């Protein structure tokens, strides 16, 4: 199973930005409250304006993540010196497009700009995670890291910002995203654990945790209001996620059977391999119409599991004659921290001189 074709991954689209005309409000505030020439900070203001322009047209690459993190941090630095939050003196309209409806949503609140940038950091990480083939050591590692980073961004958004500036960033939707991203990180970890020839004991537990994350994502996708918001996207995601629940359950029980093989409990071995084959057959039914990438993974796994089940039953029936009978998850991935105000990720405070 170390050589199994890779399943495709889900990613999220980036949100589209509208206007955030901070410059005139900053100048008014500098003149009225800092008592200084309103044109004394034009270099700082142009540097921030250029950074926003870069962030809202971010390249879909690892450098783009750094741009979003830098801009997110500089918005925190600006807010610490000029009050542009809800109801505050220097607040100006912030407009972004809600991604599922295509409608513009405006709030006079710099933290809404921060929220959308952080969302896009999560979305970009999900894209980068889903782009690699996951066949190289560096590619498997970075894909896992990307999905952990995506989970961390959506979780930070959920916990540290006003709730539901727009419905694409509501707590329930962000929780779906976090679970999906952790499930995909755990799937990347499973692939690596099999290439590293970890103990069947551990591989089964890792795969069981993949199932656990995807089951929670599936539960969320079945919620009628989530299904309504995501529309046809919910149909697409649910088909892939529901198939993966059975696929990785089969992978877990395959490795439980291999543990029985190692412990010379050849009756248990047959029972786990039979359960694995039954779960994989359900995954194959659920994969009707899925792309060739999905079909290739399932066919490869059918060759492994079907052949192991057959040989295990033959060995039991004619050699060992053991009774055939009738898994706790290992969460080893976590959302990785955003650290929005660490100077190593933000660089120097653009407005350090405004004091």
Residue numbers in the entry: 1 to 326, 333 to 361
Publication excerpt:
His domain protein tyrosine phosphatase (HD-PTP/PTPN23) is a tumor suppressor that regulates mitogenic receptor downregulation, endocytic recycling, and cell migration (Chen et al., 2012, Doyotte et al., 2008, Kharitidi et al., 2015, Lee et al., 2007, Ma et al., 2015, Manteghi et al., 2016). A central feature of HD-PTP function is the ability of its Bro1 domain to recruit CHMP4, the major subunit of the ESCRT-III membrane remodeling protein complex (Doyotte et al., 2008, Ichioka et al., 2007, Parkinson et al., 2015). Crystallographic structures of the HD-PTPBro1 domain in complex with the relevant binding regions of SARA, endofin, and all three human CHMP4 isoforms reveal that SARA and endofin binding is similar to that of CHMP4 at the conserved site, but critically extends into a neighboring specific pocket unique to HD-PTP. Altogether, this study identifies the Bro1 domain of HD-PTP as a highly selective interaction hub that coordinates recruitment of endosomal signaling adaptors versus MVB sorting and receptor degradation.
Y2H experiments confirmed that this region is also relevant for binding to HD-PTP, since CHMP4B lacking the C-terminal six amino acids (C4BΔCT) did not bind AlixBro1-V or HD-PTPBro1-CC, while full-length CHMP4B did. CoIP confirmed that CHMP4B-FL, but not C4BΔCT, binds to HD-PTPBro1-CC. Next, peptides designed from the C-terminal 18–20 residues of CHMP4A, CHMP4B, and CHMP4C were evaluated for binding to HD-PTPBro1. Interestingly, CHMP4 peptides showed much lower affinity to HD-PTPBro1 compared with the SARA/endofin peptides, with KD values of 132 ± 7 μM for CHMP4A, 85 ± 2 μM for CHMP4B, and 89 ± 1 μM for CHMP4C. For the CHMP4 peptides only 11 residues are clearly visible in the electron density maps, whereas 20 residues are visible for the SARA and endofin peptides. All three CHMP4 peptides bind in the same way across helices H5, H6, and H7 of HD-PTPBro1, and form similar van der Waals contacts with a number of conserved residues, including the critical L202/I206 pair. Additional contacts occur with hydrophobic residues at the proline-rich C-terminal region of HD-PTPBro1. The main CHMP4 anchoring residues are a Leu and a Trp present in all three isoforms (L217 and W220 in CHMP4A and CHMP4B, L228/W231 in CHMP4C), which contact HD-PTPBro1 residues L189, L202, and I206 from two hydrophobic pockets between H5 and H6 and H6 and H7. Thus, binding of CHMP4A/B/C to HD-PTPBro1 requires rearrangement of these side chains to accommodate the critical CHMP4 Leu and Trp residues. Binding of full-length CHMP4B to HD-PTPBro1-CC was unaffected by the T145K mutation, confirming that access to the S site is not required for CHMP4 binding but is critical for interaction with endofin and presumably SARA as well.
